[PDB]
Design a binder for this molecule. Structure first.
Ligand SMILES: *[C@@H]1O[C@H](CO)[C@@H](O[C@@H]2O[C@H](CO)[C@@H](O)[C@H](O)[C@H]2NC(C)=O)[C@H](O)[C@H]1NC(C)=O
Ligand SMILES: *[C@@H]1O[C@H](CO)[C@@H](O[C@@H]2O[C@H](CO)[C@@H](O)[C@H](O)[C@H]2NC(C)=O)[C@H](O)[C@H]1NC(C)=O
Ligand SMILES: *[C@@H]1O[C@H](CO)[C@@H](O[C@@H]2O[C@H](CO)[C@@H](O)[C@H](O)[C@H]2NC(C)=O)[C@H](O)[C@H]1NC(C)=O
Ligand SMILES: *[C@@H]1O[C@H](CO)[C@@H](O[C@@H]2O[C@H](CO)[C@@H](O)[C@H](O)[C@H]2NC(C)=O)[C@H](O)[C@H]1NC(C)=O
Ligand SMILES: *[C@@H]1O[C@H](CO)[C@@H](O[C@@H]2O[C@H](CO)[C@@H](O)[C@H](O)[C@H]2NC(C)=O)[C@H](O)[C@H]1NC(C)=O
Ligand SMILES: *[C@@H]1O[C@H](CO)[C@@H](O[C@@H]2O[C@H](CO)[C@@H](O)[C@H](O)[C@H]2NC(C)=O)[C@H](O)[C@H]1NC(C)=O
Lengths: 583, 583, 583
């Protein structure tokens, strides 16, 4: 009787199913959450008189219908068009070469080009109908507003590392962007994968290749699967023979089956409309004093700085520099960002060994952390590489039968070294990784592991006749703070010929290691690594109540009242009586 | 008149049958339980106006329809795609190489590749319709909330080993994950198994193999079973002859039968939608002070640590390291995780014998446990391998005719040894296993059993002329704490050439043994070993009442009131009057 | 107006007929009883809107449809797949090699392979629809709860051997398992039995055998019985000639007749759904203090120990060790469990004779049991083999015409011996068996019987010229406590070349005897031996009232009130006043 169903009973019209305002993940092109609030109170319609739209939504009739007769050749996977999220992946940002490179449509296309030495062609019937946009005066959703107040409460009780944790659960549930405009329509695409040596002789008749690819697309749709085709004349005999893959997907409308008139596909697009393009803005753009009137001024500029840090950390991880030229050697298959590390010679290095010590600062009673946090050399110059503090909580139970239990914490800082007539290297495996020497979390035969950063193992053998089959050279560790001195004989990268691999993200800082195997390189493409990148804190910090919030340079002060009402602006006679009881 | 049927009478629409929030087992890809609460109070619909969804659920219209013309070749079973649970099996975890490897679809595919020396190809018509997700503000179910309070009660009465037992009955009923997003659709798959020598000559024309496999798939669906096929031209005469198996399964929609137009299959997908992909989060992620407001802060961080231990124990068991290379010798068929134990030479070892002693600490009266807990040598250096305490309860009946009965417990610790001109080895069989020398729980002819770990038998014969037909060499015992010293002449694994096998899980610690038979290796694939991995405790621990719960480092205290009301936060004037009567 | 018919009148929908919660026998794959309570109060439906389900039941839509084009060859009957109860027969248990080996489907398949020297192939169309499971919070049925209280009453009046008898009537009525999940669907199977020499030449073209077996299955279903088949080309001329049997069974849906389109079979599966797979848990798992809140704690852990003993006794009986290799001699046809007793030489033994004595302890008046309980030698070293006490009740009638009758009991312990120039052996026959020398309960010509264990006869003749046609050698008696000393010249088994046979189960202990005939071996397969394995007791034990139940180690006590109300927990001021009047 309220909301949609009140409008839907009076009008008896469908609701438009393609709406802006939701969140958007831009590494993996998926949408998530609902940032903006959508209400159906005035019973608005599209001025066709055909759909029902919310109140803060205006549509623009496009009624456009493209129809292409030539496929387009896109040879490299580095410059990637998306066909559904092209306007939002190509924004001007620092990470424009990482957007969309963890999606379903991209990971298939990179696989089919590398494993077959192939080039791809697509041809398309696109058919845009509306453009749906949001008004500039707009209200946040009920569930998204409550999660921004919780980050503000943790920042005003001096609880960092809990506000940082709640900011990374905001990226996980609402993405990195907000879509401000969509495009309702229905596409129909065919992608083929031709052998790359079929293009190189037909450099003059490249226009004859793509003319037959768009010719075969309209035989596939118009003719039923039995061969009544009109394309097999001259070069639709090697086009069929140099191709390595073919698929046809429809995105809106009715489902596609071979042999359906393009007349009949285009008459089922009504009431089956999806978003075939979209654009938007980053997520921290919508955190400003205009959208949040209840909080003070400089407090929402501190929440918006926290969320901006969590989004940029999510792009800093899931970024793999390496070599990208396919015909060159040292080709890294997991790399999504070029480095210039191609055509670079190598030089062998000898590492003496790794060792690890612990400190055991506070928790001397009832918990002994400083036995597994220590690792000594099985057999140069060591480097420190990390200063990491490990905290653990335990439980007493004082009984008196009534009892009580108290929770302490136990700190133990550890230090992990490596030496710059030497131990061999057999790979690494962690609690989120495997060793690709064995395709399993095990060192090979003869090798023995030893812990280095409290979560991963270091496959090492001291021999020179039996473990020489799995021995791969080593290039050096570095971190987010200290680069290795092996490059520039500093910078944070591998030397030439080597490739880096992530290992052991530890509280907003990952360390890396350089190898030269060729076996760590290949395999399947890695998935995206989702936030939170930190385990939850133990609530060890005490809450410090803040009552008055001020800034010095325009003489504005916000006084929180009793009862936790709200933040009102401080009149200059009440803050005069509130600072004496404070100071 | 309430719930679904109120919405279903007014709207007269079906309910969407694919919903998130339930649990998920990730070793065996099955779903179980319902973690989140789903209510039908606002009578929401999908904005098509076609289905009825719960209140805390938002759908995203995809309306996508893939159609592939080439099969994909996946040669090895180590890297396994799932086609229905691919997004959730490929999460970043320590056990990413164990996820999905106890399911129905995997165990068939590993069988058909090993027993036939085969490679598999699949081709597919996929047709995604919606994406159904859960809101971030969400309530736990009624039955799942009550089982989290019961683990908290056992932890606050100092009843460990009962809270551990109730945590493993939570994994059994709710799985290891919670699905947060699903994909409603309907697939249609054909899998074939070709002989592996048919690929190796057609390395150039691998694109001609997969083009005919996708050609035979559309003759099978479009043509009725009588041969009107258009594929038998050149190489659809050995493709039919090198294949070893073939099946066609549909996952949603109407049931498949040979000869049905793809037009007709795609018009029955409405109202028959299932989940063709899903993703989610671990189960202990949803145990935090946000979801459970009634309990104190550090108490739900102790329940969530108990459940995380029970899940990681379930992945530690059901993990079989071994050799994986098929053409190599020493191939272990039960192994699902590689080890590097391939291409390793062997060395014979002589074991003198096993013997076992008991202690009989407490239960000296009315129960004699220290006669069957003892086993002496039928005929080096012994090792201790285990220190295990065995508890049994009995019953007095004091009569006075009125009577009364009291229940005691009887402890008897046992020790089990083995010696590092020697007894022969004939296999083992236990209360959850058989001896594969006989395919039965019996020692072979000439062999006599003797108990070692209070539940299993050790097939042993002292002869050298008659029991030499069933004698297999022996590689050494080890445990979860002590590795054997036979490797690295320590580590917890077999020496080279040998294979390990589980035996006698005893209270969260299993022991293993290394053999070299070739007969223990083969057979059928083992099923998953389900929790609980411990028999229920005897309630021997006394309940210690806790009233006040505090942590030192933010000065927060929770005071339980009378009557077992609830846990309220302690004001600093009541805990002042509650600690004096305590201390 | 209540229950099902209230929901069935309002909704006008059928009820789903495949439900969990019932018991299950796992030797004979049949279901029995109803352990869990199923109520229809909320009028729930399957979210299709198609069936009506109970309240504590959640379904999972699968909508899957397999279709196989190759038969599968399973050569041996030792590893047996069931096609309807495969998930529950393959549980990890001590008796995994006995589950399902007394069913209708197994006993036919073992018969057709031994009597024809055949191998079996099956091909199948499987079509799973739902998965129906039970919630973890669940209530026992009304009739099953009342039979658990009756075992508890007999255990608390010190009436053993009546609580043991009532526990074996619980296995008879409710089976050994409880099904917790089923699978609603409809299969369609063809099994053939080919001659075993037809596989051995087609080792390379084994893939051509199974391709024609799945080809003949789809000619049988699609074509009417007149030969319009498309399979008789090359090797569908000896496949038809090497086969020894063929049947086609359907399990759900409409009944099968030759010539019905697979289109038409798959459209009758709606409203005709049966369980095509199931899984579950043992029966004593569901006897815990959670399910039975009324009884005390350690009392339901004593009922659950009694039921676990009765189930394991039912698997200990119905277990036949013997030789299993078919082409080897000494092949035992009744044996369902291997022994290693194949390829073993024999040695003749001479037994002097059997004799039997009685004691007549108590019933000296009015009943003379010690004349038929005695048997003397008709003509070494004797062994005792058994100490069994025989009790019989009689009736006085004291008259005074008014009268009264009193019932006593008469005990008479007997001892049965056999000697380790000798009596010949002609077989045995009992009150539940026959002599297979005559296929009747009679000794052969010249032989005379003599009683040994108060129920069976021992066919014996002292001659050497006339009873030499039916004389078979003898291998020795043993029991559940004492093995024979003839093996290991101890163990409880036959010597080599001999086979054991059950005789005279007497109060939870059977004795066995070893022969070497070849005529006792063959015949038909024995049926399952159902509980109770003990005749009912004579109520000779006096009832001892228990009022207070306690355990020592957590200081909990349960005080039964007056009137036989119930068992309440004892407050520490009432048990203080209840132990003084007790002690
Ligand atoms: C507010 O929080 C910050 C962040 O932890 C505190 O700063 C640290 O406090 C510890 C405790 O003495 C010091 O050892 C560190 O050196 C401090 N670090 C920095 C960068 O200042 C701060 O003390 C807290 N303030 C209050 C009043 O609790
Ligand atoms: C892949 O493409 C090449 C063209 O670069 C094909 O090679 C030509 O095939 C035609 C077919 O008759 C010949 O007449 C030409 O002589 C070939 N060479 C050149 C340089 O044009 C090749 O055949 C294609 N692959 C397949 C499998 O057909
Ligand atoms: C709380 O439970 C723990 C776990 O059993 C108890 O700790 C053990 O208590 C026994 C009994 O004296 C000792 O023999 C063990 O050495 C203890 N082990 C450890 C690791 O402490 C503890 O005593 C219980 N506390 C109370 C008050 O009952
Ligand atoms: C399995 O595949 C092999 C190909 O590796 C087939 O061998 C070829 O069969 C064709 C059939 O006429 C012959 O012309 C070729 O000479 C064979 N050899 C090669 C190297 O191509 C083999 O026939 C297939 N199996 C079956 C049963 O047909
Ligand atoms: C409770 O029942 C048990 C089981 O029969 C009784 O134990 C036996 O009692 C007889 C009668 O004197 C003795 O001859 C046996 O030696 C006893 N056996 C055992 C194993 O104890 C017991 O006496 C009964 N108790 C009462 C109070 O009636
Ligand atoms: C049972 O199978 C055997 C195959 O092992 C059949 O023997 C062959 O029959 C064909 C029929 O013409 C002959 O051409 C072959 O020479 C036979 N021998 C071999 C070794 O292949 C046998 O005929 C089958 N039984 C029946 C009754 O047909």
């Amino acid at each position: 009787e309220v909301g949609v169903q009140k409008c839907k009973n009076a009008l008896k019209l469908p609701v438009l199913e393609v709406l802006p305002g939701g969140g958007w993940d831009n590494l993996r092109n998926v949408d998530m959450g609902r940032v903006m609030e959508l209400t159906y109170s005035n019973c608005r319609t599209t001025e066709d008189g055909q759909y029902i739209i919310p109140d803060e939504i205006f549509t623009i009739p496009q009624k456009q219908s493209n129809l292409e007769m030539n496929s387009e050749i896109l040879e490299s996977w580095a410059n990637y068009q998306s066909s559904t999220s092209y306007s939002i992946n190509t924004e001007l940002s620092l990470f424009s070469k990482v957007n969309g490179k963890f999606s379903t449509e991209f990971q298939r296309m990179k696989t089919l080009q590398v494993k077959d030495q192939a080039i791809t062609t697509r041809v398309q019937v696109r058919n845009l109908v509306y453009t749906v946009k949001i008004n500039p005066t707009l209200e946040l959703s009920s569930g998204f507003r409550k999660e921004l107040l919780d980050i503000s409460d943790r920042l005003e009780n001096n609880q960092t590392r809990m506000a940082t944790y709640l900011a990374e659960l905001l990226v996980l549930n609402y993405g990195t962007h907000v879509t401000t405009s969509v495009d309702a329509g229905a596409a129909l695409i065919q992608e083929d994968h031709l052998r790359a040596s079929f293009l190189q002789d037909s450099q003059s008749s490249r226009s004859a290749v793509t003319a037959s690819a768009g010719l075969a697309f309209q035989n596939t749709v118009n003719f039923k699967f039995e061969e009544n085709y009109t394309s097999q004349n001259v070069l639709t005999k090697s086009y069929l023979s140099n191709r390595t893959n073919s698929r046809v997907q429809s995105i809106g409308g009715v489902p596609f089956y071979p042999g359906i008139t393009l007349q009949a596909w285009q008459q089922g697009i009504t009431n089956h409309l999806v978003a075939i393009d979209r654009s938007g803005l980053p997520l921290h753009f919508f955190i400003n004093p205009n959208m949040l009137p209840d909080l003070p001024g400089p407090l929402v500029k501190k929440v918006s700085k926290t969320v901006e840090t969590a989004v940029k950390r999510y792009y800093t991880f899931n970024t793999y520099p390496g070599c990208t030229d396919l015909n060159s050697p040292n080709f890294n298959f997991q790399a999504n960002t070029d480095d210039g590390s191609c055509e670079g010679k190598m030089t062998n290095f000898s590492f003496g060994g790794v060792y690890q010590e612990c400190t055991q600062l506070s928790g001397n009673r009832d918990v002994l952390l400083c036995q597994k946090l220590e690792q000594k050399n099985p057999l140069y110059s060591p480097v420190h590489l990390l200063s990491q503090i490990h905290e653990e909580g335990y439980n007493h139970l004082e009984c008196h039968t009534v009892c009580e239990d108290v929770f302490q914490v136990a700190k133990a800082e550890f230090r992990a070294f490596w030496c710059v007539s030497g131990l061999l290297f057999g790979g690494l495996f962690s609690s989120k990784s495997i060793n690709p020497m064995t395709n399993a979390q095990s060192c090979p035969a003869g090798y023995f592991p030893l812990r280095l950063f409290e979560n991963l193992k270091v496959c090492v053998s001291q021999d020179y006749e039996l473990g020489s089959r799995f021995a791969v050279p080593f290039g050096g560790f570095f971190s987010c703070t200290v680069g290795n001195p092996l490059v520039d004989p500093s910078l944070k990268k591998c030397p030439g010929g080597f490739s880096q691999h992530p290992a052991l993200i530890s509280d907003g800082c990952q360390v890396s290691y350089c190898v030269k195997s060729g076996l760590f390189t290949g395999g399947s493409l890695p998935p995206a690594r989702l936030p939170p990148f930190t385990r939850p804190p133990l609530m060890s910090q005490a809450a410090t109540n803040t009552v008055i919030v001020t800034n010095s340079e325009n003489a504005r002060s916000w006084i929180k009242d009793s009862q936790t009402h709200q933040w009102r602006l401080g009149e200059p006679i009440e803050l005069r009586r509130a600072m004496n009881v404070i100071h």
